[PDB]
Every structure is written in structure tokens, then in C-alpha cells.
Write an enzyme that holds these catalytic residues in place. Structure first.
Site, PDB file in Angstrom:
ATOM      1  N   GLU A 136      21.300   7.872-118.669  1.00 24.12           N
ATOM      2  CA  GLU A 136      20.767   8.679-117.569  1.00 24.12           C
ATOM      3  C   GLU A 136      21.800   9.141-116.540  1.00 24.12           C
ATOM      4  O   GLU A 136      22.021  10.341-116.355  1.00 24.12           O
ATOM      5  CB  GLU A 136      19.671   7.901-116.832  1.00 24.12           C
TER       6      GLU A 136
ATOM      7  N   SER B  97      11.714  13.389-115.108  1.00 20.19           N
ATOM      8  CA  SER B  97      12.379  13.311-113.806  1.00 20.19           C
ATOM      9  C   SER B  97      11.298  13.228-112.722  1.00 20.19           C
ATOM     10  O   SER B  97      10.428  12.353-112.783  1.00 20.19           O
ATOM     11  CB  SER B  97      13.263  14.558-113.604  1.00 20.19           C
TER      12      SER B  97
ATOM     13  N   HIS C 234      20.421  12.185-118.513  1.00 21.09           N
ATOM     14  CA  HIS C 234      19.172  12.661-117.926  1.00 21.09           C
ATOM     15  C   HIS C 234      18.933  14.128-118.288  1.00 21.09           C
ATOM     16  O   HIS C 234      19.839  14.952-118.145  1.00 21.09           O
ATOM     17  CB  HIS C 234      19.263  12.516-116.401  1.00 21.09           C
TER      18      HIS C 234
END
Ligand SMILES: [Ca+2]
Length: 483
Positions: free
Chosen positions: A309, A188, A398
Site C-alpha cells: 500500500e 481507498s 495502493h
């Protein structure tokens, strides 16, 4: 074996548990409090006693969005958060490869000491040293005030990261590590930070390998940074001649100002208010551009994304952005021309919104970074497809690969209510094995997977899942559309 190690600033005393030496809460910079707020990190004052390195330092102040989920026990917060932690396998062998973790959290959340990042398993299983750390977040680290005073520094959080890496280079040999075999890895915001560190002059030679998980080139213009800074000062009632209050106002008030700003300027996921910014003195230009110029020549790169994601940022009941906001996003991300050409791909709806996140915030930047770096160093790319089969967590979203990387599979309970099956333990083993072999050799190939080199002619990609597979030029149509 009592584990006292001398750092350049003083002795620290660790501990040994289950075959892993651990040192937590080691100062690497002067607490950026008061007058040192908004200023580059300075060395910490030396100590000649023996610092107890058995407890984690405070984490950077932030809303509790992530802390209340990552910890079962909310950790203490304070601008005094610049500390590193070291996990080393109990082995006679010295000069072990070193893996330095830069945590994610969209630049305003997180801490290197979250339980998910405990490096004991990774250290023991890969036989490498694992270093975790905190860097200034939100308004403390990604509020750029250089335009208001050359005395202030922009990209503070990135400079903090660079300082921790310098500390690793100067001190890790004392913990049994090899300062010439440092691999930086992050997910991230951590992956996006690594993109920047790869293009920051003051980070030259601080690491020899890099792993970027779900995160690549991410910056706001110098203009936007100045615009957001002025807007921020207003909310604080501070003007060009009252820059004093910036160093006296409580940290708690800076967080409130930030959230008000978030609301005032209607922040959306496509353009975070606090993120890296172009600045001649710290981040001269877009990482992707610098890398295409060879700025990271000779540095092997392991990079990838998760297949789904976006599903991490929006629930089935999430509000759908207006056309006005959506067009503004597509235009900001791809530019007027491409935005119009691709407008077709994302017809207003929750679906398109989510696909815009996955495609434009993660996949496109990843392919763009991998492609650029492939002309100057070895590049290895993957796509993480694993996810529980039954709803509601049946998406490779994600953050989901994190438990596998660190081997802290108990975290999968809170993240996706998934049980630790042999399938899960096997995928984690293959991933940790590849990550640590990469840190050791610059090639992630292991008995479990023969990783093909990624280059623009074939774009071979490894698919991480219960069953490992390889895809050549995955999603060719979309790629050709986005590029
Ligand atoms: Ca001893």
C-alpha cells in the site's frame, strides 16, 4: 429498445453500446449550491420532459492532482455534481444484482465518472448492473460545521452516498436491477466510506453486501471536527455571526482556504483534515466499534488490502517526517501505550514511514474490521500481491488492483507502465469473476479460487496474484504485535 426509463423524478433516456445499456448524468439530489451548501442532500426538482442521460455530470471541485492524471481531458467541475450513472448488460433477464461503486481519493479527490470506473466491462462480464456516482468532497463534503449551527449537517459526503443508495433502492428496478440484492463496493476513501455507511443509522437496509478495498474504519473525533471547522472559518475571515458568507463565497475560494488550512496546520498522511467525523446525528461512533456490536449483522463482507500500500504515497526522494511528527502519528493511531510498545517497529526513515502507512492506515484497520464482522456475517479476506517485476513500479501499491476489478486494463499503462499480458488479463478475469459472484451469492468462490471463510481462529486469506494462493494467519508476528 430506445431506453427511456422513468425515475421517481422524471424520465431519462440512455443508449446502448456493445451490448451494454448506459445512462450517464442522472440527478439524484438537488445541486448543493449556495444556501444548500453544508446542508443534507434534498431530492432534485422533478422534470416532466425527457432528460438526455448520455453525458456525465460535472465532478466536485478539487485540486487537479488526480483529474489531470485520470483523464486525458480535464472534466468540468462544479458543486453541482450529484449524479449517478448506470451500466446494464443487454440481457432479457430482469432483477440483476446491482453493484454500486464509491470512488476513493482520500476524501478530497476523484469522481465516479473517471475512465477507470467505466462499468461497461464489469457489467457485461459479470452480468450485473453497475452504478457509479459522485459525492461532495473536501470542504464541500467533509468540513463539519454542525457545532456552529444545528441547521448544518456533518459528514455531508457520506449523506450524499446514502442518498444515492436510496435512489438505487427506489429506482434501479426500472433499469432492470434487483433493489434487494445491492452490493456496495469502494476503494481507498470509498472503502472507508462503506465502513461508515455500515454503521450509519440512516443507511440501514440500503445494501445487502459490501466490498471494502484498501479502506476500513476511518474517523476523526467530534472535538477535532469542531477544531478544524473553526480553524477553517478563520482562514475565511468568517466568525460565528457572519455565517452568511459561507453560502455566498465562491467554491474556488473554499478550495484555496482548504489548501491554506492544509499548509497552516501542517497536514500529513496519517491525519487528513477532511475525513468522516463522529457526530450523534450522522455517524454516532467509530465504525469498527459499531460493527463489533453487530450493527452490520447478516451482511457478507469481502475485504482486503494490497501488500505494498504505502509505496503509492512516497517516492524514493520523498522527505522524511520528523520524530516529533512520527511519534504524534503513532500515538494518534495506536494510543500512547501501544505506540510506545511498537515504536520499536518503526525507526525513523523513509522505510518505516511507508510501512506505517501500509500497516496502520490500511492493514491493521482491515484485519480489525474483518475480525469484528466475522462474528455476525460471512467474511472473505484477500491481499493483493501483484506488481510488475522490474522497477520502478515493482510494488503492490495502493490503487493497483483497480484496473483488474473494473477490467479497464488500458489504465495499467498510466498507473504502472505495465503491458496487458495474458498474466494480467487472467488475474483481472479471476478478480472480476470473484467480485461479481460475490455480488450474486455472497461468496466469492469461483472455478479459479475456492475462497475460505475468514474467522479469528484461522484467519485464512486469499492472495491475489498471477498465481492464486492461500495463507493462514499471514504476518502473525506483526498482528500479535499490533493487537
Ligand atoms: Ca424502446
Amino acid at each position: 429498445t430506445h431506453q427511456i426509463v422513468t425515475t421517481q423524478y422524471g424520465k431519462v433516456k440512455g443508449t446502448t453500446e456493445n451490448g451494454v445499456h448506459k445512462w450517464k448524468g442522472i440527478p439524484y439530489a438537488k445541486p448543493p449550491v449556495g444556501q444548500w451548501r453544508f446542508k443534507a442532500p434534498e431530492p432534485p426538482e422533478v422534470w416532466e420532459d425527457v432528460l438526455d442521460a448520455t453525458v456525465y455530470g460535472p465532478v466536485c471541485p478539487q485540486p487537479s492532482d488526480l483529474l489531470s492524471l485520470s483523464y486525458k481531458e480535464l472534466p468540468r467541475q462544479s458543486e453541482d455534481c450529484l449524479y449517478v450513472n448506470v451500466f446494464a448488460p443487454d440481457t432479457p433477464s430482469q432483477n440483476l444484482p446491482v453493484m454500486v461503486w464509491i470512488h476513493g481519493g482520500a476524501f478530497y479527490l476523484g469522481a465516479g465518472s473517471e475512465p477507470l470506473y467505466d462499468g461497461s466491462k464489469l457489467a457485461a462480464q459479470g452480468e450485473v448492473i453497475v452504478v457509479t456516482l459522485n459525492y461532495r468532497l473536501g470542504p464541500f463534503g467533509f468540513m463539519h460545521l454542525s457545532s456552529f449551527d444545528e441547521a448544518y449537517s456533518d459528514n455531508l459526503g457520506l449523506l450524499d452516498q446514502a442518498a444515492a443508495l436510496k435512489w438505487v433502492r427506489e429506482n434501479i428496478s426500472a433499469f432492470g436491477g434487483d433493489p434487494d440484492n445491492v452490493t456496495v463496493f469502494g476503494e481507498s476513501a470509498g472503502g472507508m466510506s462503506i465502513a461508515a455507511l455500515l454503521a450509519m443509522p440512516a443507511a440501514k437496509g440500503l445494501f445487502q453486501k459490501a466490498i471494502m478495498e484498501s479502506g476500513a474504519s476511518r474517523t476523526m473525533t467530534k472535538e477535532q471536527a469542531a477544531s478544524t471547522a473553526a480553524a477553517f472559518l478563520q482562514v475565511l475571515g468568517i466568525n460565528e455571526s457572519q455565517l452568511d458568507r459561507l453560502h455566498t463565497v465562491a467554491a474556488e475560494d473554499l478550495l484555496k482556504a482548504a489548501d491554506q488550512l492544509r499548509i497552516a496546520e501542517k497536514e500529513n498522511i496519517f491525519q487528513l483534515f477532511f475525513q468522516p467525523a463522529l457526530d450523534p446525528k450522522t455517524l454516532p461512533e467509530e465504525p469498527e466499534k459499531s460493527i463489533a456490536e453487530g450493527a452490520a449483522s447478516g451482511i457478507p463482507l469481502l475485504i482486503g488490502t494490497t501488500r505494498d500500500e504505502g509505496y503509492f504515497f512516497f517516492t524514493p526522494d520523498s522527505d522524511v517526517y520528523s520524530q516529533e511528527t512520527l511519534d504524534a502519528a503513532l500515538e494518534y493511531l495506536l494510543g500512547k501505550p501501544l505506540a510506545e510498545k511498537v515504536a520499536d517497529l518503526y525507526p525513523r526513515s523513509l522505510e518505516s514511514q511507508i510501512h506505517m502507512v501500509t500497516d496502520l492506515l490500511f492493514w491493521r484497520p482491515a484485519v480489525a474490521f474483518a475480525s469484528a464482522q466475522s462474528h455476525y456475517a460471512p467474511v472473505w479476506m484477500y491481499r493483493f500481491d501483484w506488481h510488475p517485476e522490474k522497477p520502478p513500479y515493482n510494488k503492490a501499491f495502493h490503487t493497483l488492483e483497480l484496473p483488474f476489478v473494473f477490467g479497464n486494463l488500458d489504465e495499467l499503462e498510466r498507473m504502472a507502465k505495465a503491458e496487458i499480458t495474458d498474466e494480467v488479463k487472467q488475474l483481472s478475469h479471476t478478480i472480476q469473476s470473484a467480485w461479481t459472484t460475490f455480488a450474486k451469492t455472497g461468496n466469492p468462490s469461483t472455478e479459479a479460487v475456492n475462497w475460505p471463510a475468514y474467522h479469528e481462529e484461522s484467519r485464512e486469506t486469499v492472495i491475489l496474484d498471477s498465481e492464486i494462493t492461500i495463507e493462514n494467519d499471514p504476518e502473525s508476528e506483526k498482528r500479535q504485535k499490533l493487537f
